[PDB]
Amino acid sequence: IAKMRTMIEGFDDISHGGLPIGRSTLVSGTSGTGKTLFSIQFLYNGIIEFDEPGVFVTFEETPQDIIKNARSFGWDLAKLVDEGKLFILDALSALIERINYAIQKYRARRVSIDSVTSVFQQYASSVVRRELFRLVARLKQIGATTVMTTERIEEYGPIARYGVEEFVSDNVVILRNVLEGERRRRTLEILKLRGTSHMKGEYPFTITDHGINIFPRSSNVRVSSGVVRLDEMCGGGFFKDSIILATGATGTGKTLLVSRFVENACANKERAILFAYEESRAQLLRNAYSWGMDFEEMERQNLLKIVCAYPESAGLEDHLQIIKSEINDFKPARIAIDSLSALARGVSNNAFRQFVIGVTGYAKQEEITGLFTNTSDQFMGAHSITDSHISVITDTIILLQYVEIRGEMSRAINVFKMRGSWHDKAIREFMISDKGPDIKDSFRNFERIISGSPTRI
Amino acid sequence: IAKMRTMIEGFDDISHGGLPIGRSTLVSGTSGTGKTLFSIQFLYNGIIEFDEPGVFVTFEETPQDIIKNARSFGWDLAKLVDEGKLFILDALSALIERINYAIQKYRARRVSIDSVTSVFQQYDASSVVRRELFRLVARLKQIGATTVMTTERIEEYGPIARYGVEEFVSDNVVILRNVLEGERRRRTLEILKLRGTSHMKGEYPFTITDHGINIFPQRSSNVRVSSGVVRLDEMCGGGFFKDSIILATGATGTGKTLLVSRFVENACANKERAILFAYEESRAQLLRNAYSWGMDFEEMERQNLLKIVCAYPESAGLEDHLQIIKSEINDFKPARIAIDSLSALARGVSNNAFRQFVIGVTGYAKQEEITGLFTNTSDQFMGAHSITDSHISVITDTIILLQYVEIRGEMSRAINVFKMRGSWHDKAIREFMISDKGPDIKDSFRNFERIISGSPTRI
Amino acid sequence: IAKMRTMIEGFDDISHGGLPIGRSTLVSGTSGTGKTLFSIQFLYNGIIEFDEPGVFVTFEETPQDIIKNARSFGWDLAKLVDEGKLFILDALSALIERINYAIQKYRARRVSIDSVTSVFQQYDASSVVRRELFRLVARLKQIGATTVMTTERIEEYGPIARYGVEEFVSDNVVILRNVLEGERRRRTLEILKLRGTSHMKGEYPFTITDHGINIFPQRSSNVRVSSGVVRLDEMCGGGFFKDSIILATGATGTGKTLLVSRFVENACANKERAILFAYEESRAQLLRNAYSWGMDFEEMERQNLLKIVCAYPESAGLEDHLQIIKSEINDFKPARIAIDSLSALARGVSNNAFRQFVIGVTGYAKQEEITGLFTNTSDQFMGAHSITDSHISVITDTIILLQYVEIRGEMSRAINVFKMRGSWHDKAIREFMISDKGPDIKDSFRNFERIISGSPTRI
Numbered sequence A: 001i002a003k004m005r006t007m008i009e010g011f012d013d014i015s016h017g018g019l020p021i022g023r024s025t026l027v028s029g030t031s032g033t034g035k036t037l038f039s040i041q042f043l044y045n046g047i048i049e050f051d052e053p054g055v056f057v058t059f060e061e062t063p064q065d066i067i068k069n070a071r072s073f074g075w076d077l078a079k080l081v082d083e084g085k086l087f088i089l090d091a092l093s094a095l096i097e098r099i100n101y102a103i104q105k106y107r108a109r110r111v112s113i114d115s116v117t118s119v120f121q122q123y124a125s126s127v128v129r130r131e132l133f134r135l136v137a138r139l140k141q142i143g144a145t146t147v148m149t150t151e152r153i154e155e156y157g158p159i160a161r162y163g164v165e166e167f168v169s170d171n172v173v174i175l176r177n178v179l180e181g182e183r184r185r186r187t188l189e190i191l192k193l194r195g196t197s198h199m200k201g202e203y204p205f206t207i208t209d210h211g212i213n214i215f216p217r218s219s220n221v222r223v224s225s226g227v228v229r230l231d232e233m234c235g236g237g238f239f240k241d242s243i244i245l246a247t248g249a250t251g252t253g254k255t256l257l258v259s260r261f262v263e264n265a266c267a268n269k270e271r272a273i274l275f276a277y278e279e280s281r282a283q284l285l286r287n288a289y290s291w292g293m294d295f296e297e298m299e300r301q302n303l304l305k306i307v308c309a310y311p312e313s314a315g316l317e318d319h320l321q322i323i324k325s326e327i328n329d330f331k332p333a334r335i336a337i338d339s340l341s342a343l344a345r346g347v348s349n350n351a352f353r354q355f356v357i358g359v360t361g362y363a364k365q366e367e368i369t370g371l372f373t374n375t376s377d378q379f380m381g382a383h384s385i386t387d388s389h390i391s392v393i394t395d396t397i398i399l400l401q402y403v404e405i406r407g408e409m410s411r412a413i414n415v416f417k418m419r420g421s422w423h424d425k426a427i428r429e430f431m432i433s434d435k436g437p438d439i440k441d442s443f444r445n446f447e448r449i450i451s452g453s454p455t456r457i
Numbered sequence B, C: 001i002a003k004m005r006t007m008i009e010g011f012d013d014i015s016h017g018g019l020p021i022g023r024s025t026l027v028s029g030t031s032g033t034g035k036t037l038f039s040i041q042f043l044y045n046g047i048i049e050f051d052e053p054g055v056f057v058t059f060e061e062t063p064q065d066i067i068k069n070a071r072s073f074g075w076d077l078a079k080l081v082d083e084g085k086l087f088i089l090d091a092l093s094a095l096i097e098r099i100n101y102a103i104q105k106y107r108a109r110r111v112s113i114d115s116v117t118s119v120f121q122q123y124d125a126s127s128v129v130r131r132e133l134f135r136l137v138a139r140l141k142q143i144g145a146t147t148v149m150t151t152e153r154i155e156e157y158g159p160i161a162r163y164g165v166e167e168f169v170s171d172n173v174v175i176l177r178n179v180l181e182g183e184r185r186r187r188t189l190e191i192l193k194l195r196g197t198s199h200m201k202g203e204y205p206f207t208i209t210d211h212g213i214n215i216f217p218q219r220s221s222n223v224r225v226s227s228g229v230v231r232l233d234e235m236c237g238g239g240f241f242k243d244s245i246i247l248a249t250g251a252t253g254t255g256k257t258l259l260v261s262r263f264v265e266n267a268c269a270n271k272e273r274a275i276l277f278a279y280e281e282s283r284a285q286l287l288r289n290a291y292s293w294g295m296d297f298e299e300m301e302r303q304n305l306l307k308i309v310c311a312y313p314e315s316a317g318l319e320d321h322l323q324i325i326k327s328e329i330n331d332f333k334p335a336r337i338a339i340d341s342l343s344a345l346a347r348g349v350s351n352n353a354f355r356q357f358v359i360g361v362t363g364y365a366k367q368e369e370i371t372g373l374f375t376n377t378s379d380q381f382m383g384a385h386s387i388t389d390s391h392i393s394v395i396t397d398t399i400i401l402l403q404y405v406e407i408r409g410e411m412s413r414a415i416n417v418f419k420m421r422g423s424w425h426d427k428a429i430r431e432f433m434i435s436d437k438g439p440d441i442k443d444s445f446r447n448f449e450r451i452i453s454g455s456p457t458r459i
Ligand SMILES: Nc1ncnc2c1ncn2[C@@H]1O[C@H](COP(=O)(O)OP(=O)(O)OP(=O)(O)O)[C@@H](O)[C@H]1O
Pocket: A029, A030, A031, A032, A033, A034, A035, A036, A037, A038, A072, A073, A207, A208, A209, B167, B168, B169, B192, B193, B194, B195, B196, B197, B198, B199
């Protein structure tokens, strides 16, 4: 069974090649799941890259409205109709004959129906099947790949409205929009692909100006973090394609280290992106300048780009897209996320694990040095790193620990781990000043320093 | 697809402009969600904003009832027949023709229908409803008059509409909620879809007030303000920042309310207005305890500089509380506010709903350049461990941790500036005492180990 | 009641022989569970195994579609009319008579029907269906030809069939599932009942591949194999065992992957094949870090001795992963395998489903006489406490615990052979260092107490 490419970023790999040629694919889902978008995008990309005639059947939707709604993604379906490339047929063997006629009037390749469920109001489960079955057979006879749109009531219930459509259609795709904690998450899944292989389970996708966005080397080159001693602690600075992690309690120096790392990019005429999620530009600019860093300058040189946003505003799959797009445009040398902990609150651990995998996978695929920070939810930072499942994904771990010494709340920097590279295994004390960090010596005559409450030995 | 600004505080940002032009927007929700209110507001804010002739189609309720109902928001029916700005049509093609007639009659551009699900009593089938509902929107689309369609739902997280077909016929779907969690109703609005345009997905907390619907979707000065204490001001490196959020965490009876008192006192002392949002004790008690420390809060209220807003945290919703703060701040326009306490507002509340609150209050306090001192009673003896397990301690710019320290078989207390964003601060846990004139911050414990625990040992 | 071997890897053990002779077996499941595949396989493995004339009755799909569909498993339709081994009948007594006719026509013994629930569209009542369904099985029983009946279900844990009556009419009931848990589908097969015979109750994880359905239901040599390290080999008492499972637990960045590297290196060093199943880092990174320790994994791959299979643990199901290992081991046929790591495969997975995995991998590794070194990042600083809270540390024959030890305000690490089944081993927690040539296992900490905690104290 040959597969037809849809040029939909993600789907091509999730369906292992694309949609089965000659056969009809069902794309069911609730309202606003992107059933119509997918159907158009299948046709559009079809004759916008392969020039293979395709006709779109429409029921409770004026062709103008479709072409108008499609203009939201900068598409000219009217220009495609002004060259006889696409054909919108306004809307039961009558349609079957008309559809077969149109198809042959162009010499078909792809067809889209939106929606068949709407053209079954009058018709009763068994009646829908008998008519749906007959349709499904009258397409395979012509040998045209058709995407069939179907309506759903529940997100985790019947596949179709009458629960007899999935058993007729050869290929079943389910578009979802699950609401968890007042946050909407779009997930696409291929339930079955008769006579072929595909990826099982749902995959986080987002709808943008590009349309559907489904999301399914190792050089010894070293880059500076912005601290001479920190580079000496890491054994000649970080790697130019690795993922660093600054874990620690609130007000330790995670944002300070991010700044010094983002600065060191613009210091070497290298572009960097800072994704803020905790503070705003306003505070970031002041705090930065207080440490002797001119962020405003770095932005004036077109080397730094600050992108602050509320973590609880957009969804995790949306946050990633924003990064990708922001990285695709600016093309930064190194990026920083301040912080991951801000994007994990009010989210599932499974949905968050996939996020860090995506950002890490895309940061390393483009050879971009990433410095992600994370606020530990325990005083013993050593124990917080173990509970973190993202700490095994990262290549370097820079843990900042509070240490109570002589009734003073001092701090300590330590390179926890450094993959395929030597690092200093000493918990060096450090202080913050108007210039930045001052990594001094490591506590020698002190035991149980990992607790954050040591004892003189 | 052009957007029609509804002028509904919040919706204009969540809709990325507003409602699509010449498209049929559906608004489903359970009984008392605030559909009609939204529907009226849409027309109301249309007429008295961009001189737009709006036509309200009634069904269940009469024009008089609607006119009288909207009188709780101070909206007159002088735009009705007195001006010809509105057109309340008391109540399938028979009605559609009337809407098409009244349209060009007043040049009507904005249209509201309530309710469209009440005109499907003569039927019982979804197929019969779909066909008749599809015919309506289609007819309105030809007129090119972007209208609002009201529908009713049984469940809050069930089908979009009563017949589960009205959402797929319409282009724009807005779902108003009133979800009951722990005997507390939370009004949340969501835009499900917007055919041919973009919007914000997921639900957004809103409230109904005398203003109607209230949807809730580079300064950073180095200027320093006093905290009310001198040692504390020195501990932070010349007092707190102006547009900064301070947090005083500690065990119950450490001195969170004491610090809040001095912070509010210091405002009125500099002839600056302050607002104290009490949630634990009542004005009566607060007035007494304040004076015991040598502070006349009654005097400060007599100068129209300090305003105390006491209320039970287990009565109104977090969204209701936020609106109260906003309104109380918009009225009085203080220099600095104080919340006593966040912990009291977090009792029997979803951690999601709490974060959204604090973000909103922090966001509005920093936007209006207001110094906020929020308190939070720690749920452990080790205050440091409480700070770590908090999704707010990262949001606050300054953290003032008050810790109990058992020394020489005595219940002594210690204060320390945990953190101070973009500022030097004393990194020492110095013991403090409370007297009849406020706090006396003494010296830190040089010869003591494991003070964070609260049960230290002499070195 | 005699059993008909279906030759379906796993089913033959779960069915205690196979399907009952001259009895009507029902196979219900949701859409895409793999009913037709099972139905074809039943006939396919019947013809090309014990020369059995099988008749496939179609209903919804045509013979051409089915023939073309089964071409993804490399099965030709040369057994159809080209030989007369099969009999695809395109589509109540009218059909039954045809089945009874075609039966003796080809001497048909095996029969498959798909789907029997599609021929109940003309009806809507269960009583009408039951009567017509009962008549079918009864008629087939008289012929004495044991057939497979396909049915469709709406829910995964709801009624057995669409009309909830087909299970009680049939004698044998098999339920295929595709349960979605955490955006991950798990294919599980169960035999509900087997009237007049015994079987295995509860669901069993299976997978669909190019081989079709893959259901997953006294040696013990004293021979010793090297671990790649000399001190470690001495610590275990002359290296690890051959058909033994080793486990390296510890905190992130202790040296689990380092040990895995030496274990795999030592294989290829003795001209032995090894497979490294990476799940954390990618070949790119692994290749670099390996060389930094003085190991050329590229060289080992150039000798066709080492094979690296990197893949994301949060993409495929545990059953999908097991099949991959099995296939990759069946192809390459290594001396020793390595999993880096089990912890990475246990992320967002049911503890039940994980145990079944490890049992399966451990079981297959010990059965094929393959030395396995599985790693597992501990979720606590105290490694000993992690070992205890593990349903796998008891399954492993050897445990190699790597522990972080803060000594003289330095992050030093310690290694110790936690346990070694039927073998003496060094019972000392000796400190080790990592350099550009692998690990340097030094001496244990004689003058240190509470080392298990990770924060010891000088004695
Ligand atoms: N430019 C855009 N950027 C981002 N999102 C957009 C944009 N344009 C549309 N969308 C979103 O994409 C969704 C896809 O709309 P579409 O018509 O494909 O939905 P549908 O599933 O077919 O709905 P229905 O079945 O109710 O007709 C819209 O509802 C809207 O939320």
